Design a protein around this ligand. Structure first.
Ligand SMILES: CNC(=O)C[C@H]1COc2cc(F)ccc2N1C(=O)c1ccc2c(c1)NC(=O)CO2
Length: 243
């Protein structure tokens, strides 16, 4: 099929500023609008990374779009836990160099309990001493962790790519079975947090002007397609270990 991990380490996206206006009042509407603008910028970076991701080109265009749309919150959350861990030792939520959440911002964002759930994942990075190599393989597994209920157009092609990245994670943990299951348990726990993040995101999207929450064009497109699929139960989370 294929070291692809050496490739993963080099294709990691550059740093993205939030463009946060600290002179503006710290309302839920202003903070969430800034987070949505940041999410739009990260999405462009995800597409650029996915195009050069080994094996991703083999999947048909329709499947590539489905995977990116279904996994956007999973990839975003996981990357947030990594930045929080790397830059603050998981003491704060490191959204961007210019946007680091303390207790105050967690309350102001009107997402306090969700922010705490996210901080719990970053605390697991500290407990496990997650490595950058482990992190890059796991991010690929998250891109390949949610599919349509009726499968993808090229299901066999997808399964081959996913299986090969799982083999890469197993090879990596040796540098071992105990660590492999600690990492798969961490990946599985991403689905529950992402579910709660999407529930709130769908809510603010469906009544955005009523709460003054702005969404960039990229998020409008992704959410408009994803929202009816997720609520109709057409999304299928892939678990290593069924709950
Ligand atoms: C730009 N963002 C990120 O870097 C990280 C990502 C995903 O992990 C999150 C965790 C968290 F604790 C708070 C926010 C986010 N992030 C979000 O983008 C997001 C999620 C839900 C939303 C919104 C954003 N926006 C809304 O209007 C309301 O629902």
């Amino acid at each position: 099929y294929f070291s692809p991990v050496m490739v993963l380490e080099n294709i990691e996206p550059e740093i993205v500023y939030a463009g946060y206006d600290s002179s503006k009042p710290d309302t839920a509407e202003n903070l969430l609008s800034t987070l949505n603008r940041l999410a739009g910028k990260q999405m462009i970076q995800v597409v650029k990374w996915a195009k050069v991701l080994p094996g991703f080109k083999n999947l048909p265009l329709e499947d590539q779009i489905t995977l990116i749309q279904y996994s956007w919150m999973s990839l975003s959350s996981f990357a947030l836990s990594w930045r929080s861990y790397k830059h603050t030792n998981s003491q704060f939520l490191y959204f961007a160099p210019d946007l680091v959440f303390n207790e105050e911002k967690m309350h102001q964002s009107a997402m306090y309990e969700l922010c705490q759930g996210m901080h719990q994942i970053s605390l697991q990075f500290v407990r496990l001493q997650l490595t950058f190599e482990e992190y890059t393989i796991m991010k690929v597994l998250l891109l390949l962790s949610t599919i349509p209920k009726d499968g993808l157009k090229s299901q066999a092609a997808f399964e081959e790519m996913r299986t090969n990245y799982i083999k890469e994670l197993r090879k990596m943990v040796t540098k071992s079975w105990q660590r492999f299951y600690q990492l798969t348990k961490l990946l599985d726990s991403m689905h529950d947090l992402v579910s709660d993040l999407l529930e709130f995101c769908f809510y603010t999207f469906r009544e955005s002007h009523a709460l003054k929450v702005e969404f960039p064009a990229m998020l409008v497109e992704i959410i408009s397609d994803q929202l009816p699929k997720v609520e109709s139960g057409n999304a299928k989370p892939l678990y290593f270990h069924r709950k």
